[PDB]
Design a protein. Structure first.
Lengths: 238, 99, 99, 235, 99, 99, 99
């Protein structure tokens, strides 16, 4: 009549819809929360390993020549002093590196926040394109692979069978489950800047020749759980 | 059930609007018409969402959310219809004042 | 209390509506009842948000849904009840004008 | 009592403040939400394509596909020589027919940009003849497995019957890894990876796999720097 | 059409304000002008959300975003337009009192 | 800060309500009491959300929005307090209409 | 700009309030002051976000989001400012009724 009281109902509708959209936002969090948790789980474990690697090895990179390259890898520069001349035999110099580096390296890997966040520790042996002998492109690629695979495996042979590097029973079995000796070749070269080739730069032929200790995070399994939980739930309603 | 309530609510508001405009001469029924049309549409929006809320399963968030939004999206048409027809009544009231 | 607030909100508005209809011949208590029945619905919407967010945890949002769903149920059931009974009094006002 | 006209506008502003907030949250999590969808589309798409192309050849080759994007080859002593890395002619003809159609699926528009690594994995049983040491039963098995795994890779790109163009070879160099495994990662009688309370096998645990790794870790990673760049962009 | 919905809401409230100011002397149209202008902004807020959620899917948010954002635009633009022009009428009310 | 001002907002509304019922006979303070009581409650609710909005950012929405909801949980207690005491004033007006 | 638009809106409301209290005696401008003060704050809240939503499209997400959040974080400070000064005007009207 004289006073229009439908504004009271309009305020009632606006207030109720105000929390309905607040409810919808809350419901949307629950609907997609495992998917949202994957990037932060990856974010915390990669920087956690990166911070732990820095917290443990900054004072020792100069002596070893290694560098952490923000990819959870410990890239050891200057080969031909870590391995024999054209052979997989380990030189003495790399042994004291292996005795010192690995014992305090596995502790970070075999730690409560990191033991269940790792699928693979990749020992990778990379080789420059120029073979010592023939200049072929295909048969020399697989000649490097034979050498690099043995050089990487010889590193893995001494990494837990060494008397100084005393691995326990519960620690060795973690290596056979989480460690891979991958012998790469010219297929993964490093340019003069120190990064992987993207625009077709010139390989340094010395930075490419390297041995790396790369860590792989189990973030693919977390994404698989989201897919698996949806597939099992979808099949449940059939 | 929710979709039928929204269609019934929208159809009801139009029916009262036709009743409100076929008289158009009471001068007291028309004065209360904007309030009734908007309140009726607000009522059906409230009921449509409320019926969609009781069917929401807090355990099964993944499948309840599409069902909740299906009834929510059709509930706003009742409130919009009530305000639209009440605006016409007030627009017609303005047109009478210009004379 | 907490999970009985939606029924208390609905029941309170029905009780006030029953008071309004037994005072129908006053015609001064009327024309104020629709504005007060809806206002009580607005009161229970604010209570719904207040009780729906009182136990909200930022760390655990999954467990806060049942408590927040309680508030939305209280807000929508009581607001619909207040709007519905305000509609009835508005409709009864039409009957007085037409009779 | 005309204050309700102004109040209805305040609650209207409060209404759509949380509507935008819900929308803003919805927008900013779309990249995270799409990651399981990208993984589901690529993994099932690769598995369906692998099943479509090779289901008629699993029984003759002895291969098995187990929804892990891998082509597991059973029945040793015909793939390689007895205790040697030399490739037998039986597996050479298998690689000729299998790989050309295998690489076609791998070098496809929906999959070429969704693949990070294709792993050739040579697995060997836990027992080595002439040795009774657990430590010595893992490395000379790895020496043989690494050469056998490299032998398959060497044969693929240095053959005369596989139509490997000059441009496809670089793709194998940047993706194909000859990862020679060892006594680790055994298989039980059901073909499932061993658990704490299960045993292993000998003719089933000795295998050669062609496993595909999708680049979902990079897609998960690319969110991290994008979030960091967005955070750094406000400073 | 759907994409040109925010401008239709702004254009209609602007048009009614122009009608509200060509009279400027009835003093009964002007007393109803701020309520009608604000109600239309509420009307386009209701129908704007209605078209925003008409094609909204909780799974495919990206494909439901262009329509949802357009519905938010027409809700905010019309609410801003309705309040702004209702405020101009209110401001003009003082200017009659001062002189 | 939002939690502390919730008690001040609620505590103030009770104080103004007491001042409103100390007079209870002016008939001009009482007619404006429900409007001021509700407006004060909405004011403190808006400040509680405004304070919680300055800490909201889109850099990390997966924890900023849960932080926003955890900060504005007590903002609606003043709104509920304002409507509740305004209802009492309105109800007391009805009680005086029965005589 | 939206920070300055909100600051202008907040600054403008304090400017009209000063004009509204230096008179304090007209009693016809004063009764319209609380509505206009709230309406001005409502307008600046709406236009603050509406301006930020002009260039906010599905493709301009990484670009227009920073300027949309700036409007969101400051829009409701003008609405609270207008109600705060409108409440003072209404409260100052109570103190006149007690004498």
């Amino acid at each position: 009549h004289h006073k229009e009281d439908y504004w009271i109902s309009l305020s009632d509708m606006m207030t109720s819809l105000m929390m309905l959209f607040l409810l919808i936002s809350v419901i949307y969090m629950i609907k997609v929360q495992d998917s949202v948790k994957v990037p932060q789980i990856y974010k915390e474990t990669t920087q956690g390993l990166n911070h732990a690697l820095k917290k443990e090895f900054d004072k020792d990179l100069m002596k070893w020549g290694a560098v952490i390259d923000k990819d959870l890898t410990v890239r050891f520069q200057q080969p031909d002093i870590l391995f024999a001349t054209g052979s997989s035999a380990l030189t003495p110099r790399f042994k004291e590196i292996l005795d010192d580096f690995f014992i305090r390296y596995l502790k970070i890997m075999m730690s409560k926040p990191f033991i269940n966040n790792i699928e693979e520790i990749r020992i990778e042996g990379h080789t420059s394109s120029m073979w010592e002998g023939e200049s072929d492109r295909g048969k020399a690629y697989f000649k490097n692979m034979t050498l690099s695979q043995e050089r990487t495996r010889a590193t893995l042979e001494y990494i837990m069978t060494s008397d100084k590097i005393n691995l326990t029973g519960e620690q060795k079995e973690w290596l056979m489950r989480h460690f891979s000796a991958i012998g790469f070749s010219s297929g993964h070269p490093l340019t003069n800047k120190g990064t992987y080739l993207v625009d077709g730069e010139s390989e340094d032929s010395q930075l490419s020749q390297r041995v790396e200790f790369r860590v792989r995070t189990n973030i693919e399994r977390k994404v698989a759980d989201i897919v698996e939980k949806e597939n099992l739930y979808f099949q449940g309603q059939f | 059930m929710i979709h039928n309530m929204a269609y019934f609510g929208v159809g009801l508001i139009t029916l009262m609007f036709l009743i409100f405009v076929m008289n158009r001469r009471n001068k007291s029924i028309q004065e209360l018409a904007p309030g009734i049309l908007i309140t009726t549409g607000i009522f059906f929006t409230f009921v449509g969402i409320a019926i969609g809320l009781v069917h929401f399963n807090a355990d099964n968030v993944d499948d309840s959310l599409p069902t909740l939004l299906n009834g929510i999206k059709t509930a706003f048409w009742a409130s919009a219809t009530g305000v639209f027809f009440a605006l016409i009544i007030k627009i017609l009231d303005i047109f009478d004042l210009t004379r």
